[PDB]
Design a protein around this ligand. Structure first.
Ligand SMILES: [Mg+2]
Ligand SMILES: [Mg+2]
Length: 293
C-alpha cells in the first residue's frame, strides 16, 4: 500500500485532518500519514534531522525559501492567511473585562497567566513576541513587551540602526519562563488543553484555531496582529532571532506548501497539493477560519 507522508504546522491540524479524510476517500488504499510540529521544527525535521516527507506545509511560507531552497525544495505555493488573537474561555480570569483596548493591562496583573509557543520552533511562538512588541508603539506604552515578556523569560531585545526591534531568543532550555506568568509549549496547539482546563487564562494563537476550539478571543489591532498585507510596513519593524541565528521578520501571516525535492511519493504529493489549492481545499480552509491569500 502507498503512503503519503505530510509534515505540517500545528495550526493546520484540523483542516489537514479534513484534507486527509477527503484525499483518502478519493484514493482508496492510500494512507495519508500526518505529522505535526511547529513550522520551523517541521522544516528542520527535513533539513537537519534526515526525515522524509512528501508534503511540507508551513504557517510562515518564508521558512521554505530561507531554510529549504535549493537543497530540499525548489518552490512553494502560498495558499492561506491567518490572524493573531488572544484566546480565552468563560472561566479565564477577567474574561468579562478584557477587550482590544486593555488586554495588555489584564496580562500585566500578577494573578493572570498566559501561554505562547517556543519562538525557536513555531511561527505562532515568534509571532506572539512580534505582536507584543508592536503593541508598544500602537498603544504608546514602551513597557508592554518589557513587562510581559522580558521580565518573565530569557528573551532579550536590542534596537537596530534602522530602528528595527530585534528580539533574541536563547536556547530553548534557557527561555526559562516565570511559571506564575507563562506556560510555554513547542507549538501553539499544545496549549489548547491548558487554556480549556484553566491552567492558563490567555493564549497567543491564531484566530482559526480559536474558532475551531470554540475559544473566545480578543481581536487585536490590524496594525499589530500580522493579519493584513495593508500593514506589512509596520509589521517589519520587529524581527526575531532564533538561537540558531535564523532571523524572521514581522510580516502578514501567509501559509506556504511545497513538495520536498527528496520526497518519496512526489506524484501522489502532486495530487494532494492539487486538492489543497483547488476548490475543495479552499472550502475546507475557509470553513475552518482561514482566509485565502
Ligand atoms: Mg491516514
Ligand atoms: Mg518596551
Amino acid at each position: 500500500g502507498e503512503v503519503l507522508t505530510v509534515f505540517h504546522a500545528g495550526s493546520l491540524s484540523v483542516p489537514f485532518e479534513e484534507l486527509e479524510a477527503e484525499f483518502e476517500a478519493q484514493h482508496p488504499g492510500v494512507d495519508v500519514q500526518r505529522e505535526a510540529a511547529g513550522s520551523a521544527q517541521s522544516v528542520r525535521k527535513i533539513t537537519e534531522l534526515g526525515k522524509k516527507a512528501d508534503v511540507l506545509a508551513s504557517a510562515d511560507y518564508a521558512l521554505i525559501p530561507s531554510l529549504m531552497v535549493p537543497e530540499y525544495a525548489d518552490w512553494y505555493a502560498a495558499f492561506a492567511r491567518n490572524q493573531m488573537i488572544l484566546a480565552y474561555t468563560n472561566e479565564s480570569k477577567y474574561g468579562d473585562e478584557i477587550n482590544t483596548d486593555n488586554w495588555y493591562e489584564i496580562l500585566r496583573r500578577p494573578d493572570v497567566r498566559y501561554g505562547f509557543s517556543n519562538p525557536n520552533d513555531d511561527p505562532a511562538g515568534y509571532r506572539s513576541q512580534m505582536v507584543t512588541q508592536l503593541a508598544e508603539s500602537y498603544y504608546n506604552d514602551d513597557m508592554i513587551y518589557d513587562d510581559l515578556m522580558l521580565a518573565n523569560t530569557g528573551m532579550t531585545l536590542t534596537t537596530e540602526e534602522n530602528g528595527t526591534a530585534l528580539i533574541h531568543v536563547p536556547a530553548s532550555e534557557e527561555i526559562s519562563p516565570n511559571t506564575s506568568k507563562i506556560m510555554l509549549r513547542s507549538m501553539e496547539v499544545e496549549l489548547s488543553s491548558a487554556l480549556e482546563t484553566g491552567e492558563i487564562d490567555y493564549l497567543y494563537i491564531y484566530r482559526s484555531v480559536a474558532e475551531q476550539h470554540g475559544f473566545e478571543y480578543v481581536a487585536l489591532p490590524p496594525a499589530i496582529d500580522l493579519s493584513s498585507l495593508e500593514y506589512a510596513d509596520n509589521y517589519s519593524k520587529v524581527q526575531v532571532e532564533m538561537v540558531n541565528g535564523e532571523v524572521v521578520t514581522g510580516s502578514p501571516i501567509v501559509y506556504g506548501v511545497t513538495i520536498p525535492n527528496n520526497a518519496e511519493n512526489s506524484e501522489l504529493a502532486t495530487e494532494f497539493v492539487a486538492l489543497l489549492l483547488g476548490e475543495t481545499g479552499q472550502q475546507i480552509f475557509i470553513e475552518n477560519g482561514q482566509p485565502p491569500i
